[PDB]
Amino acid sequence: QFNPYGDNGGTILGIAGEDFAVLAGDTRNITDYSINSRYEPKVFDCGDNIVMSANGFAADGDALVKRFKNSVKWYHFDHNDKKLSINSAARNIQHLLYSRRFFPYYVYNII
Partner 1 sequence: DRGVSTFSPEGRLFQVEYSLEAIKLGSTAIGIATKEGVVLGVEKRATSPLLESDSIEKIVEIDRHIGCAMSGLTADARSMIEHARTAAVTHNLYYDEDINVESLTQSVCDLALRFGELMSRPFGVALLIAGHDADDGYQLFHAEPSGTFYRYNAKAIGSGSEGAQAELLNEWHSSLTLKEAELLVLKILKQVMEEKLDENNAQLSCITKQDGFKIYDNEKTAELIKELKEKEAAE
Partner 2 sequence: NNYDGDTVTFSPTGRLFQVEYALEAIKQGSVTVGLRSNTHAVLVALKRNADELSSYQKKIIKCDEHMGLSLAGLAPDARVLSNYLRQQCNYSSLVFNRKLAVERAGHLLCDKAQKNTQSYGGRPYGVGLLIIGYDKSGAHLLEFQPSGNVTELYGTAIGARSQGAKTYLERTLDTFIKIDGNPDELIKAGVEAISQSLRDESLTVDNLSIAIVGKDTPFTIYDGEAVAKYI
Q: Which of residues 1-60 bind partner 1 (CB under 8 A)?
A: none
User: Nearest distance from residue 60's CB to partner 2, in Å?
Assistant: 16
Breaks, C-N > 2.5 A, in the chain lie after: none
Q: Which is nearer to partner 2, 11 or 99 (CB)?
A: 99
99 forms part of the interface with partner 1 (CB under 8 A)? no
For residue 75, the surrounding DSSP H or E stretch is helix 58-78
Q: How far apart are CA 43 and CA 82, in angstroms?
A: 24
Q: By three-state DSSP, how is residue 96 classified?
A: helix
Q: Which of residues 61-100 bind partner 2 (CB under 8 A)?
A: 66, 70, 73, 77
Binding site for partner 1 (CB under 8 A): 75, 78-80, 82, 85, 87-88, 90-92, 95
